Symmetry: C5
Subunit: 213 residues, 5 copies
């Protein structure tokens, strides 16, 4: 109930409940099925681009959602959501397979837990990537691909799925960048390796962008 959002004792009790039930290191699989993790990158800035080394330096908001129904509660007379330090929650062990620098989180490491068990997590991340920068100076642009998946959980445990397939992130991308976004595509993809018998799901984010004229 929105009207109870500012009831501090309710918020405290919800946080307590969440911390009692939460298993931060155990995947929250329900009904013996993979955890469905929804991922969408919203690019904010393209800071540096190197056509020689095929590297980009970018900032994006990583819109991330999943469900853990064990966290649910009846919010008929209490806040429908609270903010929770992610140290109290399981968070998917996502990583970009072509990152060449640490993900630098620029934002408070908090998630929102919804009373129906949904968890919303959106770090702003600055990170560098190895990807195809060729054509950045042309009108058709470069198409830089970023692959994001679970670092240790295979497809039977975690499914990593794109939320939206297409956008030019108009609400998000800085108008002040020297680059402009032509199109952002996000599709599912499965990866396997000769060493290991299982498949790993990821989202392939295709960033089509060019230098402004």
């Amino acid at each position: 109930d929105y009207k109870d959002d500012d009831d501090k004792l309710d918020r405290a009790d919800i946080l307590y409940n969440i911390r009692q039930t939460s298993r931060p290191d155990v995947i929250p699989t329900q009904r013996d099925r993979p955890v469905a993790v929804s991922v969408s990158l919203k690019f904010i800035n393209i800071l540096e681009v190197n056509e020689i080394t095929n590297e980009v330096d970018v900032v994006f908001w990583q819109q991330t959602t999943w469900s853990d129904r064990t966290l649910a509660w009846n919010s008929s007379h209490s806040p429908d959501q609270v903010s929770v330090p992610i140290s109290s929650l399981w968070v998917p062990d996502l990583a970009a397979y072509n990152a060449i620098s640490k993900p630098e989180v620029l934002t408070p490491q908090l998630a929102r837990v919804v009373s129906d068990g949904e968890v919303l997590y959106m770090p702003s991340i600055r990170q560098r990537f190895s990807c195809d920068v060729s054509g950045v100076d042309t009108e058709s642009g470069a198409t830089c691909r970023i692959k994001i998946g679970s670092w240790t959980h295979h497809s039977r445990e975690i499914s990593v799925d794109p939320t939206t397939e297409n956008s030019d992130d108009s609400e998000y991308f800085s108008q002040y960048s020297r680059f402009e976004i032509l199109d952002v595509t996000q599709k599912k993809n499965s990866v396997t390796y000769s060493c290991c018998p299982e498949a790993y799901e990821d989202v392939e984010v295709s960033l089509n962008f060019r230098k402004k004229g």
Copy 2:
């Protein structure tokens, strides 16, 4: 009362009281209202500016205040204020929406808690931003807008109070900067997204500056 400020045992007891009552992870909402957080930036320096990439590197003191009256105490015969490590307190989850680097905090991470429950927190922060640098070499200067608000709390939980005086800006800005500040103004705005209907309040700080 100020006469009792240096009573050490009193200070220790106040710190104990604050730590027993404090909920560092819960917003301190009082009487069915959002936490009103006052935020004003006092710019100290402009260090690097890039008109090609539209990026600025600045240092500011982030004046931050809010109330948590559950922290209040009777100070008739005890200190009026104490310093408290912010790890012992709830602090607003503010973030700069157009920051392109982590906020580098240059100062001890302590706040003051006043006996009426007011909390004062003022980190000196160095941070880089993406903003409009065009006009920095002209006499009308550039206007770089920095937007700061809660990262996870919407308007019914945290409201931002942007109201501040700016006639004292020269007490703060370094005389040895390569840049000069012409004007600083702040206004409230609201931020919403297609995906997400709740409104998030922010303060837009318009920094109007130019190369000396």
Copy 3:
């Protein structure tokens, strides 16, 4: 077995068992044999190569395995593997002898523990090294050698061993790199110092690579 992989309570119980049994600071010697640690570097990116200083800056996935049978469980009707934060596990104290920067871990610090007690750990690491960079711009390329072993455990305690002797690394290396790999060889190597009595059993990784034409 895989049909019980998503039994959350089972996973939680296995994580509990591992944490009860694990001794993170004690080498998992079994019988009276050294711990056999298998190491293979899968190169992802060669980012900087410095002609003059003989330095390279690389990203690699450090495939690392060893066994601790005390961690084993019956997975007839339970998950075959779980992810475990490495803070809960003993991990080999590996270091590159010719590293000239800290290993920067780019990925979640989790390992897999298998029900037969095998541990699988593979951080993505960015690190700089001092090695022979001569020939990088030639057909035959440069051969940069990286020596990896236990920092404090000698050969009676830990053996650091190669998995495969040669690798094409084609499933791993970035196709957008400005370099390409001719061969990666990884061989056993023993090191002694005149100051000190014991031998240290390490893996010598020879990265034969060149700038793309």
Copy 4:
């Protein structure tokens, strides 16, 4: 007693006593008087001087002393002093008001606690400052002022005091630096803001320095 300095059990017991008594988060005010903190910067090196941005990058040892008589013990037959991790102690919340980088501490974060309750703390700090760099290439040199006080305690709570106003720092400054120090002056200074009531004390450190071999062909 100097003869008992190396009695390990005594040192352990002193460290235990200190940890039992210490309130790391509470100012050690005595007699309703402000804590007197003595600060003296001994410059070790001037790493970089940017004439375009008016910035210096320096290394200094921050000689810091104060007392907490609650920590005192009878050293008639026990060590005079011990080293203590500063995480076990209250330490003044000092900040440089014109710093433009974090203070990077190059030394183990230990203090000495003396049996009379004196605390001695001296980190080696590398840090960047915004200050007047003009004149660095002249004979009279540049004068870069660094202002250091408590970040959150006003003058009734902490007073910050220079140990000594004038030195050339001969025992400390590297002979291999590109620069040379003419004089370091450190004076008391009081800071107030029209926004806020009380006064904050600080030490104003004026670093008078110049480039070696300022005279060039071209």
Copy 5:
């Protein structure tokens, strides 16, 4: 007993014993004498030198030993040594007095404790220093001196002693520089402000650029 080195329970038990006895924050002064700390720097690389600013950036293995007999155990039928996280141990508060950057430790922070109570600690450290780089491009080379001693313990509490080489087993063959000589000598430091003497090791790194181009 080396035959028992890999007895896991024995190792776990030794680790337990060490952690029960260890006082990580108290100097292990035995018999009212200062702790004798042995230090030898084995240089691995010289990464950058600047003859204008007189600064060097180097990597070295800091061979460090001292003893704490209270840690000693009977190894007749148990391991001779175990590795121990240094967070469980007292370690000397060493610092380089002319360092101009933080010591960057490149290696797992473990020490070996020997059953006679000897502790061996050897971090690989990357660090920058202010020292004399003049002469680096010449035959004679430069001689960069690095002073390392206790940051807070004077000579009555800690003595820091050198254990004379060109570091051939350690220095990188692929460095741009080459080492002519490394000497390490005892040294004593005092200040006007302060009575006590502080012991340090003064390390002299005599090195030069490889394959110089000179005017003959």
